[PDB]
Amino acid sequence: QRRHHTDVGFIMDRFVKINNTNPTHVIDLMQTHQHGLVGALLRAATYYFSDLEIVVRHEGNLTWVPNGAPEAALSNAGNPTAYNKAPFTRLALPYTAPHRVLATVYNGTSKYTQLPASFNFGAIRATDISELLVRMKRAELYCPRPLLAVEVTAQDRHKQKIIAPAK
Amino acid sequence: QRRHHTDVGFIMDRFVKINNTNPTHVIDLMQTHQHGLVGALLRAATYYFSDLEIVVRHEGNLTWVPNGAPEAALSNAGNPTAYNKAPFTRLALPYTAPHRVLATVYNGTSKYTQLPASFNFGAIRATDISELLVRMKRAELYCPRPLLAVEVTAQDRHKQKIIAPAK
Amino acid sequence: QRRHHTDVGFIMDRFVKINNTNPTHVIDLMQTHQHGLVGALLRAATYYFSDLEIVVRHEGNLTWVPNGAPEAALSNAGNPTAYNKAPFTRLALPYTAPHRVLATVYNGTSKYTQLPASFNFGAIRATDISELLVRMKRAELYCPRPLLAVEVTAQDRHKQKIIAPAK
C-alpha cells in the first residue's frame, strides 16, 4: 500500500476559503467551514501548529500586525504593508501566537464555546477585502477527536451521483 | 533507418482539440475525433495508459475533481481550483482511474456501444468552457487494432493536392 | 533566548514613510515621524551610519544628485536619472555624506535645533512626488539616548485594545 495521500502534512497544504471576511479581519483557522476537507480534518484534532500563507483579494494596501499587537497598530505602515498588485497578494505569515500550539476546543475560559482571543494568526486590514484564502504549511495535529460522516435517514446507504462521461 | 517519428510516446505527445465541451465536462480520451492523428492512433489500440495536460479557455474559476468524486464535489474550491488568467489555463493532471489501464472497446457491461462510466480522467467545471485541449504524456498503447485508410471510389489512387510554392 | 528581533541591523531594515515630500526633496532621515518604529529607534541613538533604498512614486523623471552637489545640478541627466515605470521606482542609494557618521542631535552650529545641512543622503527631483519610502541597509547606531513610552494620566496602566478574533 501507498498511504501518502492521508498524510496530515499533505492534506492540509491546500488553500481553504474563509467565508466571513471584514475590512478588519483577525485570521482564525476556526472560521473555516466545519464540513470542508481542511476544516473538518482540523476539527478532528484538538491541537494544531502551522504556518500560514494567505492569498487576499483587496482594494488598497493591506497591513498585517502579528498576534498581541494592539488594534490601533493596523493603521501604520511600519507593520508589513503590501501594496496591491492586479489580481491579489500572496504572502507567507509565520506562527505568532504565544502558546506552543493552538487548540480547537477549550474547556473553560482564560479571563479571571468561545476559544480565547489569543488563538489567532494576526490581523489584516485594508479598505475592503473581498476574498481570503489560508494555506497551512508544515501542519501538525495532536489529540485526535471524533470525525463524523453524513447521516443516513431511511435509505440503504448514501446515494450520490458520481461523475460520468455518458453522452 | 530512423524510426524516431513512429514512436508511440512521440506521436501521441501533442495537443488535440475535444470538440464537445460543456460547462461541466468529464474528460474522456474517447471524445476526440476518430479520424484525427492522435484520435485514430488511439482507436488503433485496445488499452492505453497516459497522464494528461489540458489547455482550457474558460470564464471564471476552474475546478477539477478526480475520477470517482461525486458530481456535487465540483461546487467546492477544496478540489483543485485554478483562477482564470488572461489567455487560458494550462494544467497537468494525473491518472486517477482505478483500473490499471483504460480501454477503447468494452465487450459487455459493468452494471449488475458504451464504455463503462469509470473510463475518464476526472471532471472540470467553470461558468463556461470555450475550448479544451488534451495532451497525452508518456502514453503507452496495448493490443493493436485495425487502422483504416481512406477509401477510393473509382479512381486508381487517392488524389490529394500537395502544398506547392508554384507562382 | 533568541534575541534576533532586537538586532539593530534587523529592526532598522524596513521601509518607513517620510511624510513631508516636495517636488524637490532632500533625503534627510530626520524627516521620519518621531513616534514611528524606525523613527523612534533612530531618535534613540546619537550617531548612525546607513546605506539607503528608496521607493518613490513620482510623475516624470526622477534625478538624484549626491550630497554636496549644487541645487542647480538637479536639472541635468548626467546625474543618475530614473525613467518612471508604472507602479513606482525602487533604487539603492549609497552613503554620500562627507562625515564618517551622521548624528541626530547637534550641540552648536557649523557656520562661521537645526542639524548641519551636510546631514543628508542627497536630493531627489521630479515633476512631483506623491510618496517616498526609505530603508536603512547595514545600519549601525552609536551612543544610545533616552527612549520614551506613552504616559499614563490617571489609569493603573495603558489600556490598548488588542486584536481579537471574537465573533
Add this chain to the structure above:
Amino acid sequence: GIVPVACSDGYGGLVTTDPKTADPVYGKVYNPPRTNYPGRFTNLLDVAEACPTFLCFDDGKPYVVTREDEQRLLAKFDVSLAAKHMSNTYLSGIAQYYAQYSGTINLHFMFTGSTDSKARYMVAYVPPGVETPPDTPERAAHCIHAEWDTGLNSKFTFSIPYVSAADYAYTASDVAETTNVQGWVCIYQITHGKAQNDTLVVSVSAGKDFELRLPIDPRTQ
C-alpha cells in the same frame, strides 16, 4: 546583455493546491519549542488503525442482541464505508473525503453477556456474487468465514478481505449500480444458553493494508 525569458501562456495562474511557496513577510520568527508534545499523529490512517470504533445497528445501538425466534440471522449489514452501519465510524469519516480506497477492513467483536450464559457465533463474508446472501446458517459455510466461542477471551477480530474488480474501489457509493454493491457480512448464532437479553458489540477499524487515494471536498458548503 541580460537573460532573455519567454513569458509562457497559460502558466502562472493561482491553483489552490500548487506546490510553490510564497514570499516571506516576517523573517526570523522562532516559535516556542513543542518537542515531545503528547499525542501527535502524522497519518489519518494510523489513528484509523489504532482506534476501532463502534457500528450503528437498528434503532441506533452499537450491539446486536440475541433473538428468540426461528431466525438464526442475528444481523447483516453492507461492507462499505457508506453504509448505515458504518455511518457513525471514524473510518467512514476519513473516507468521505476520498474518492478511491483499497485494502482490508477488520471487524472487532466484543461479548458483554453474563458469564453464566454461553453462546456460539459464526461470521461470514459474501463477495458480489450470488443474488442473495445465504440466510440459512448452513448455506453460508461455503463462503470465507470464521467461528469463535465465548469464554474468558470475549474479544474476537475478523478481517474483511478486499475483493473487487478494479485495484481501487470507490468510497462514494453510486446513484446507479443498484443491488448488492460489493458485499455483506452476516452474524450467525450457532447456539445460546439462557441468553435472552445478552448483547454483542461490533467495532470496525482500518486494516493493516488499508489505503485511501484521492482527496476531495464532497460535502455541501
Add this chain to the structure above:
Amino acid sequence: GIVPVACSDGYGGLVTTDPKTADPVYGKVYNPPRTNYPGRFTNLLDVAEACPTFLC
C-alpha cells in the same frame, strides 16, 4: 539587486506541440502497476513489420 530579464517578443505562445511541460495540479499520485502487461508496442512500424495484412 535581483535578476534582470528580457521578456522576448515572439516567444511564450502556446504551440500545440511545444516540448515544455505544464505545472502539476495534483501531486504525488501513484498509479496501479502495469508491469508485464501483455501485448505492448512502442513503435507503429514494429507492428507494421510484425503483421502483414491483405490487399484488396
Add this chain to the structure above:
Amino acid sequence: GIVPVACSDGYGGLVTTDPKTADPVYGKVYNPPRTNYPGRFTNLLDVAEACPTFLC
C-alpha cells in the same frame, strides 16, 4: 530557444519589509572609515541590560 518563465499571480508586489535588495544607481562609493568608533551598540536588549533606569 530561450528559457521559459511563468509570471506568477500574487507575487512581485512590494511589501515594506521584503528581504530583497534594489538595483544600485551609483557604484564604487567608498565611505569614510569608521573603525573603532566609540559607543557602538548592536542590540537594544544589550543597552537595556547594561543601563538600568529609574522608576516613577
Add this chain to the structure above:
Amino acid sequence: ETRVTQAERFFKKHLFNWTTDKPFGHLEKLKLPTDHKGVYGHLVDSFAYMRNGWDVEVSAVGNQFNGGCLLVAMVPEWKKFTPREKYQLTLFPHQFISPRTNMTAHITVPYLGVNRYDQYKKHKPWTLVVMVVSPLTTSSIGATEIKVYANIAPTHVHVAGELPSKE
C-alpha cells in the same frame, strides 16, 4: 519550578449508580481536577501555575451473573457530544469495563495544553468519561444494580510561583 511528592496520592470518588434502566450512551463525566480536600487543594489555591497528569482507576462492584459494558476514557479538552459521536469515543485513551471479563480499568495520561503551565481554577484539560456501551442486564440470580467508583491521582506535579496565605 519544583516537583511535589506529597500531592501524588489516590482519592476515591463516586461516579454514578449503574442501573438497568440506563440505555446505551448514558454519559457521565468528571472534570479533573475536582474539589480536592487534601494537599492538592492547598497546592491549587496557594500556587498559581501547575502542570500534572492523571492516573485514573475505575472499578464497578458486581458479579459475573450480570451483563453490560462500560467504556472509560480520558477526553482532553472535553466538549458535549451529541449521540452521533458517542460511537467514536474510543479515539481517546480508553479501556472497557464489562462484568464478564474484567473488573477494573487503568488509564494514565500526561499533562497537555496550550500553556506550559495551567491554572486549573480556570482550565480543566483532562476529563473522566464513563458511558454504558451495553445496558446492565440482570436476572433472578443477578445484582439489580452496580455502583462504580473513581480512583484518581495527580502525577508528576510541577509548580511555580508560590502564593501567600489568606489568614
